[PDB]
């Protein structure tokens, strides 16, 4: 490393790993210089209100850092620099962040009340190009309509992307803000309106003006109201006026939130697609049905040559009997079909026309396909498969690609990095080993979700050499203490488990009961533990014994979400000389 | 061209040196990213062997570097 410092930096530029990067800092002062100097992303590990952060060496700096996440910051849910309950302290903290993080072009934040934005934006206005807001808590009632977003659209002159995907507000906030700030929204190109997956959807009276106000939009992601029982639902007329209002769109992704035929037609979707020449990513995950969609897809091939990624909800006539009817669509990098009954083993074989494109394929609730030509699309350019609610298919036997396959969503394997399994009420994991998943040398990630109305065979996963990241979602299972024991029995035997995300179940706070703590606690390898719901203060010390646990947090990221003993815990957690 | 990138240790570093001398943007990245992968995964001391480095930190600076990294989730 006698080389010129600029080339040491250029080397360190390429490190994605936070921990490896953290370890490079500890090598020598020379490459500590080099790591602080080149780091691009940082998710803060707060509390930044505490004097440990503020009065801290002021050559602790990340001068070329771009993306700063302040949503994970302790305590988890709480307001950041709200001026609601004093300025002076918010002023100073703001400047401190602005001093380690001066080149932020991209900011994530937890945003209970709009004054946090008003207190962060001054330092970064001229730089800020992307914003993610995050709010699983309820919306402060007294605020007046589009007030949550006024701080951004007034100040940040260089804003190009807005991400409300995990931000609980009302649609009338979004519509009010984005139509009364033309100077700001005329520049917007990316918009994500998820709204914490807690709305019935944007209406046509809402969706229409937003597009109207956003000519440069190149990406839109939105939940829309498609249910024609309602007079203001999203029709062909609404889709048409979106397309002519946002011509530049390359990524459009509508979907119906839920828990019968749609107001959309097939000649309407042909016109619509003719308006969107640039459409690379299309996605219409609706619950209502869109009959005989065969043509619309051929249109999409002709009108939208640049298409690659494609995902369709209840689109009923995708492919069929005879010859080319969605497979006119020459390039599909990825494709996913859904609650589409007209799909039949005839179809999947008939995609002899997407030989070059489809690295990903999925069917969700198709009820008419077989085992052995999910054994027929076997070719060299194919890598990742879901298969969700097949009344018929249950099998991994089908596959040439057992050698080539890389992810799997079902309900030796020589390249399979990832695996997402969905189960039922008191289903057993174990049969999975005998049913065809025995080896998995390279399997790093596994994801388990449960939903319904002896023990889990979690121990039976210890076969797998490199299995380090689990996500165990029991949120949707619907006393609970014995249920958490059923599911968590034998995590200890997962030797290489490094990072665990656990969702405890819901009955009217999502508490993680004592036997679960003690079951999780026996995990030796855990460097990161995140628990969706919480515990009691008096249950918290028990995680401190896990040898090298460093990252741990109680992230209630579900709507509506609901004590600085946690901070007392956090100090005790940091205290311990753990590994580097 | 990953097949190209096997080579001795000084033959990689020396390649970086004379890869930005002749201004080849593409080869500079490929060479640098390959040193970067050598560092990924290793512990602090294990990084100090692979490249013949000498800890130039008082134990007060180490624990200072350590306390600052605690403001970043891994």
Swiss-Prot record, chain A:
GO terms for biological process: auxin polar transport; bud dilation; negative regulation of seed germination; positive regulation of response to water deprivation; regulation of meristem structural organization; regulation of shoot system morphogenesis; response to light stimulus; response to water deprivation. Residues 1-43 form the F-box domain. Signal peptide: none annotated. Associates to a SCF (SKP1-CUL1-F-box protein) E3 ubiquitin-protein ligase complex. Interacts with D14 in a strigolactone-dependent manner. Interacts with SKP1, SKP5 and SKP20. Expressed in leaves. Expressed in roots, culms, leaf blades, leaf sheaths, shoot bases and panicles. One of its GO terms (cellular component) is nucleus. It comes from the Eukaryota. It is found in: Nucleus. LRR repeats lie at residues 54-92, 93-116, 117-147, 148-176, 177-205, 206-237, 238-267, 268-295, 296-323, 324-349, 350-386, 387-403, 412-431, 432-455, 456-479, 480-514, 515-580. CDD domains: F-box_D3-like. InterPro entries: F-box-like_dom_sf (IPR036047), F-box_dom (IPR001810), Leu-rich_rpt_Cys-con_subtyp (IPR006553), LRR_dom_sf (IPR032675). This is F-box/LRR-repeat MAX2 homolog. Keywords: Leucine-rich repeat, Nucleus, Repeat, Ubl conjugation pathway. Involved in strigolactone (SL) signaling. Required for responses to SLs and the establishment of arbuscular mycorrhiza symbiosis in rice. Strigolactone-dependent association of D3 with D14 and D53 (a repressor of SL signaling) triggers D53 ubiquitination and degradation. Controls tillering by suppressing axillary bud activity. Tiller is a specialized grain-bearing branch that is formed on the unelongated basal internode and grows independently of the mother stem (culm) by means of its own adventitious roots. The keyword Nucleus applies. Disruption phenotype: Increased number of tillers and reduced plant height. The gene is D3.
Curated annotation (Swiss-Prot), chain B:
This is SKP1-like protein 1A. Part of a SCF E3 ubiquitin ligase complex composed of SKP1, CUL1, RBX1 (RBX1A or RBX1B) and F-box proteins. It comes from Arabidopsis thaliana. Residues 16-74 are annotated as: Interaction with the F-box domain of F-box proteins. Accumulates only in meristematic cells. Expressed in inflorescence, shoot and root apical meristems, as well as in developing organs such as gametocytes and seeds. Also detected in cortical layer and epidermis of roots, leaves, pith and vascular bundle of young stem, young floral buds and organ primordia, pollen and through the valve of siliques. Not detectable in mature root tissues. Involved in ubiquitination and subsequent proteasomal degradation of target proteins. Together with CUL1, RBX1 and a F-box protein, it forms a SCF E3 ubiquitin ligase complex. The functional specificity of this complex depends on the type of F-box protein. In the SCF complex, it serves as an adapter that links the F-box protein to CUL1. SCF(UFO) is required for vegetative and floral organ development as well as for male gametogenesis. SCF(TIR1) is involved in auxin signaling pathway. SCF(COI1) regulates responses to jasmonates. It is found in: Nucleus; Cytoplasm, Cytoskeleton, Spindle; Cytoplasm, Cytoskeleton, Phragmoplast. Disulfide bonds: none annotated. Belongs to the SKP1 family.
């Amino acid at each position: 490393l006698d080389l010129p410092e600029p080339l040491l930096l250029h080397i360190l530029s390429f490190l994605t790993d936070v921990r490896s990067r953290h370890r490079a800092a500890l090598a020598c002062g020379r490459m500590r210089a080099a790591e602080r100097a080149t780091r691009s992303e940082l998710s803060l590990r707060g509390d930044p209100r505490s004097p440990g952060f503020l009065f801290l060496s002021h050559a602790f700096r990340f001068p070329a850092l771009e993306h700063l996440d302040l949503s994970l910051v302790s305590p988890w849910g709480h307001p950041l620099l709200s001026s609601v309950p004093i300025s002076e302290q918010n002023a100073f903290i703001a400047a401190r962040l602005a001093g380690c993080f001066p080149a932020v072009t991209s900011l994530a934040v937890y945003c209970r009340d709009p004054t946090t934005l008003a207190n962060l934006t001054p330092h970064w206005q001229a730089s800020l190009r992307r914003v993610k807001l995050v709010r699983w808590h309820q919306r402060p009632p007294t605020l007046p309509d589009g007030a949550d977003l006024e701080p951004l659209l007034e100040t940040c002159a260089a804003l190009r992307e807005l991400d409300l995907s995990e931000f609980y507000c009302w649609t009338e906030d979004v519509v009010r803000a984005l139509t009364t700030h033309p100077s700001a929204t005329a520049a917007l190109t990316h918009l994500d309106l998820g709204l914490a997956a807690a709305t019935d959807g944007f209406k046509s009276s809402e969706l229409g003006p937003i597009a109207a106000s956003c000519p440069n939009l190149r990406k839109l992601v939105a939940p829309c109201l498609f249910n024609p029982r309602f007079s203001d639902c999203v029709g062909d007329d609404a889709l048409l006026s979106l397309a002519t209002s946002c011509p530049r769109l390359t990524v459009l992704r509508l979907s119906e939130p839920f828990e019968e035929e749609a107001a959309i037609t097939v000649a309407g979707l042909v016109a619509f697609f003719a308006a969107l020449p640039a459409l690379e990513d299309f996605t219409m995950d609706l619950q209502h049905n869109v009959l005989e969609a065969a043509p619309a897809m051929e249109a999409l091939a002709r009108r939208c040559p640049r298409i690659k990624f494609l995902t369709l909800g209840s689109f009923q006539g995708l492919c069929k009997a005879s010859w080319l009817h969605l497979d006119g669509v020459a390039v599909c990098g990825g494709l996913e079909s859904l609650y589409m009954k007209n799909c039949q083993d005839l179809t999947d074989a008939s995609l002899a026309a997407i030989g070059r494109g489809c690295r990903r394929l999925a069917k969700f609730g198709i009820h008419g396909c077989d085992l052995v030509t999910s054994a027929g699309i076997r070719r060299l350019a194919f890598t990742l498969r879901p298969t969700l609610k097949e009344v018929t298919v249950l099998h991994c036997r089908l596959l040439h690609t057992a050698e080539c396959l890389t992810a799997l969503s079902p309900i030796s394997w020589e390249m399979l990095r990832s695996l997402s399994l969905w189960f039922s009420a008191g289903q057993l994991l174990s049969p999975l080993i005998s049913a065809g998943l025995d080896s998995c040398p390279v399997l790093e990630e596994i994801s388990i979700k449960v939903e319904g109305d002896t023990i889990f065979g979690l121990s039976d996963l210890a076969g797998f050499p490199v299995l380090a990241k689990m996500k165990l979602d029991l949120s949707e299972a619907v006393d609970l203490s014995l249920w958490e024991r059923f599911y968590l029995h034998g995590i200890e035997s997962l030797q290489t488990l490094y990072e665990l995300d656990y969702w405890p179940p819901q009955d009217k706070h999502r508490s993680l009961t004592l036997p679960a703590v003690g079951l999780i606690q026996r995990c030796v390898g855990l460097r990161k533990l995140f628990i969706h719901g919480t515990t009691h203060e008096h249950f918290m010390t028990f995680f401190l014994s896990i040898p090298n646990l460093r990252d741990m947090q109680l992230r209630e990221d579900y709507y509506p979400a609901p004590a600085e003993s946690w901070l007392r815990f956090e100090v005790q957690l940091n205290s311990r000389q753990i590994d580097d | 061209d990953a097949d190209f990138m096997k080579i001795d240790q000084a033959t990689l570093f020396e390649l970086i040196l004379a890869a930005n001398y002749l201004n080849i943007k593409n080869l500079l990245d490929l060479t640098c990213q390959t040193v970067a992968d050598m560092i990924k995964g290793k512990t602090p001391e294990e990084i100090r062997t692979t490249f013949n480095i000498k800890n130039d930190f008082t134990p007060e600076e180490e624990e200072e570097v350590r306390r600052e990294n605690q403001w970043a989730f891994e």
